[PDB]
Amino acid sequence: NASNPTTNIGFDEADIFDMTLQLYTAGSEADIIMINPAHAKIFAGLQENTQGSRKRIFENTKQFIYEVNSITDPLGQSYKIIVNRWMPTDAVYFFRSADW
Amino acid sequence: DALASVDGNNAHVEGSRAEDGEMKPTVIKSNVTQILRKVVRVSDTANTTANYGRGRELMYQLEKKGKEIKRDLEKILLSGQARTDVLADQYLTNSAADPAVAGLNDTHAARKTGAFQFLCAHGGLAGGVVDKTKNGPADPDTGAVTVKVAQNASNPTTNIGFDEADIFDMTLQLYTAGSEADIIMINPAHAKIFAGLQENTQGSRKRIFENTKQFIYEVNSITDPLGQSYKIIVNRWMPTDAVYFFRSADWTQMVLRAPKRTELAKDGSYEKWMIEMEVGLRHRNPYASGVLFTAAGK
Amino acid sequence: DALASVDGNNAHVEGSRAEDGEMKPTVIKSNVTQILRKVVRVSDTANTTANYGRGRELMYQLEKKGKEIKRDLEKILLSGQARTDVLADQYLTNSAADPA
Amino acid sequence: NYGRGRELMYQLEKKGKEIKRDLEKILLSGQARTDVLADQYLTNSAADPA
């Protein structure tokens, strides 16, 4: 949680890909990410950064979508997202259905 | 090896008076093949237990050794091995066949094949492995250095970070040398740079999301200013401090003996088995493919 | 199980003897189960008059508690709880030698 | 041979009788188990590397 200030409880902004790198070098082939609704707006925040390197653009479109339900790492592994209500706010799981 | 240089001026005064031509014929490159065994030795009392999932202990261990030898081959073919054999200048020497070998019948050395970093126009030998701190020589055909040490001009020459855009210079050298390569292999610990290529700090590169439920952060295709496409590939079996630019036809896997499972002698308290796979690497032209070592500016 | 580290110095010689190699065993893991129960007791003093809304309060509350146990099962599976037992690390000593 | 029959089968059956006698002696003499398992007889407890 380097980018944000020391106020947020905890979560990353560019270290979610270090985990995908670790999984790839281990051998996992999972493409799923379960998250609680509380720590969900953070995922949508990935489409915009304070640094001048990521922004949104609306060409006179009456449809605001601050949502994200799919991620892709530089290695090529897709990653769908799911919002589980009964999960704990202070955790994020990257797993597969068959593994469990 | 190469063609004949241009020599610049080509004036003439109605007469050659040459020296029987300046042909400078081709140079002969050679390579050696090594052996890979991956022995296995199991006891006899440990070959009858329940073995819930492993089942047949020896068969399971043999499959494991097969996977291990395959991984070791995938690693060595991209490693920095150096051609090492008892023959130095008498490689072919069919007639004499190195008279100074036979007589002892036990002076056999360890056959080590030439690796990619060695066959790709090296520029020295750091003891036993190709040097990762000096650029190779120039191609006599045209000015070309297919082996370059990066210069991370984005960091203050203190951080160990692979340069961001030192690949365009390597592509320039490849184009000058006549490579036509179209592939770029990279270790997983460096795709972060290729992904950041889409962005920057000056503000001239930035992604956009017009009402999209996606955060695609990936690169799998590059195009240098010269018009040469390049497909990126990830391989976890390469040295992190190296990048190779392959080409399918330029490299081939030579095989003398296929991977064979067998068993050595007996009259012991053990049931030995083993595998044997003899293989080597070949290259059409050293100056065709390209290599890029990672380091920091001096 | 997990394969062994990939070697990069295999330079075996021709016409030699096969020296024994390195082997690794298969790791083992263990866990424990969990029991969930409910109660839908009823007095039966009802059902003699003309019930108004639902009827079969027993089955209604029973389905309610079924949904409840499903919810709790999901919550438990997704929430972090250690391998708590009364053996107190004696998991690998099945049939404890101390009946105390 | 004439009574020996051969050198392999005769020797093998003789050694079989000998090992049978030795087995009976070792079983009836009296000796406690000494295999190094340290209470891990049950609970298969794979060889535990190191």
Numbering used by the authors:
A (entry chain D): 203 to 302
B (entry chain C): 52 to 349
C (entry chain D): 52 to 151
D (entry chain A): 102 to 151
Copy text verbatim from the article accompanying this structure deposition:
The capsid is closed on both ends with caps formed by the major capsid proteins organized with local T = 4 quasi-icosahedral symmetry. The hexamers in the caps are more bent (H4, H5; 149-150°), whereas those that form the tubular part of the capsid are relatively flat (H1, H2L, H2R, H3; 154–164°). The major difference between the capsid proteins forming hexamers and pentamers is in the structure of the annular loop positioned at the tip of the axial domain. In hexamers, the annular loop protrudes away from the axial domain. The beta-strands from the loops of major capsid proteins from a pentamer form a beta-barrel with a central pore with a diameter of 8 Å that penetrates through the capsid. The pore may serve for the passage of ions and water molecules from and into the capsid during genome packaging and ejection. The DNA strands from the outermost layer of the genome curve to avoid the beta-barrels protruding from pentamers of capsid proteins.
In contrast to other short-tailed phages, the tails of Kuraviruses elongate upon cell attachment. After binding to the host, SU10 tail, nozzle proteins, and short fibers re-arrange to form a nozzle that extends the tail.
